[PDB]
Write a protein that binds this DNA or RNA. Structure first.
Lengths: 177, 174
DNA sequence: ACGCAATTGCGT
DNA sequence: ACGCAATTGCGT
DNA sequence: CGCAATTGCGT
DNA sequence: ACGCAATTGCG
C-alpha cells in the first residue's frame, strides 16, 4: 500500500468518497459501503502457518453498482465514475450489468444514481437522466455526455473538507423535502 | 469441491433463492463478495490478466444485503451442523457493530442460520441479546432449543428455497 | 483493469 | 480539409 | 478462510 | 471419564 503517487482529477482515491462514507458513518448519518471487487479465487497457498496467499485468481465483471447502503431507512445505490477528458464524460466506462441493475434497483423504489467526477467538478446525475443518455447510446449515437449537457442534466455537489464529498445533502435536498 | 461438508453449505441454497427473487422482480439481494487486497497481476495479451498473488482481508459489513420494497434489507448467513447448539463463534464483533448501526437507521436486519436441519430467520435484537449475555463472559452459544422461539423457522420451499422474503413481508409493513 | 497514446470522423 | 473533440485499443 | 484435533466444563 | 462445549492448527 506504499503508493507515492499519482494524481487523478479525481477519485481520489478510495480517499475521496470513502472517507466521505466513514464520516457519514461515525456521525450516524448513513451506512454506505463500497461493495468489494469480485475475484474468482482459483488457487490458494498457506505458507508458514498463517496466512494464505492466492497464487492464481482472475477478475470477474461485477453485476451490482459500485456503492450501496442505508440512509433514513431507504436504500442507496450508486456508481461513481471519473474522467480526465476535458470535453465530455465517456459513457463507455459504464458497462452492461451495472445499468441493468440500477434499473432493477429503481424497480422497487430506491435512491439509485451516479456520482461523476469530471471537469474539475463532482456532479450528481440522477439515474433517470443517465438512462436517457444510455439509450441515446443504445439506439445509436453519442457514446459520451458532453459537459454542456452534463451540467445541464446533473446536480453539482460541494466538495469540502469533512465530508470531502457531500452527496447526502443532495439526496436530502431532493428525496426528503 | 464447492461444498466440502455433509450438509449442503447454504451458500448456493441462499444465493439461488436470491436469483429467483431477482428474475421475478420480487426484490434485489446480492451477497457482497469476499474482500481481497490484490498484490500482483500478470497480464498476458491473450490470457485474461491473472492476479498471481493476493491476500484476504476481512470486511466488517455483514455480508448480504439489498432492496425490498423501498426498504434496505440486510442479513448474515452462517450455518452450523452440530446438533449440540449453535456457536456465536461464527459472527464477529465488527459484523454485530455494523448491523447495530443498521437497525440504528430503520434498516431491516435478519440473521439467517440453517442449524438443526431447519432454517432459522433470527431477528436482530435477539441476536444482540445472545451476543450480550455472551459478552458478559456468559453462554458463548445459543443452545439448540433456546433459539427455537427466539427465531422463526423460514419456510424452506422449492421455487425459492429458504423463502425469507415473506417473513420480512409479514412483519413489515402489515 | 484501467489510463492514455492512437486513431477516427464530425463539424464548419 | 483539417482541427480537435470522440472513440478505440494496446500496454504495463 | 474449514473440518480434524485439543482440551476443558461439567451429568 | 463421556456428551457437549469451548479453543490451536494449519488443508
Amino acid at each position: 500500500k506504499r503508493a507515492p503517487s499519482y494524481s487523478n482529477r479525481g477519485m481520489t482515491l478510495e480517499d475521496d468518497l470513502n472517507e466521505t462514507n466513514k464520516y457519514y458513518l461515525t456521525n450516524q448519518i448513513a451506512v454506505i459501503h463500497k461493495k468489494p471487487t469480485p475475484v474468482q479465487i482459483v488457487n490458494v497457498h498457506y505458507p508458514k502457518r498463517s496466512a494464505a496467499v492466492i497464487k492464481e485468481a482472475y477478475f470477474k465483471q461485477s453485476s451490482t453498482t459500485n456503492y450501496n447502503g442505508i440512509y433514513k431507512g431507504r436504500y442507496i445505490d450508486f456508481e461513481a465514475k471519473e474522467t480526465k477528458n476535458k470535453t465530455s464524460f465517456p459513457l463507455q466506462n459504464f458497462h452492461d450489468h451495472q445499468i441493468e441493475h440500477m434499473k432493477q434497483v429503481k424497480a422497487q423504489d430506491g435512491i439509485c444514481f451516479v456520482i461523476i467526477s469530471a471537469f474539475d467538478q463532482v456532479y450528481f446525475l440522477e439515474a433517470d437522466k443517465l438512462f436517457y443518455f444510455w439509450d441515446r447510446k443504445e439506439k445509436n449515437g453519442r457514446k459520451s455526455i458532453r459537459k454542456d449537457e452534463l451540467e445541464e442534466t446533473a446536480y453539482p455537489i460541494s466538495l469540502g473538507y469533512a465530508p470531502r464529498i457531500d452527496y447526502i445533502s443532495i439526496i436530502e435536498q431532493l428525496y426528503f423535502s
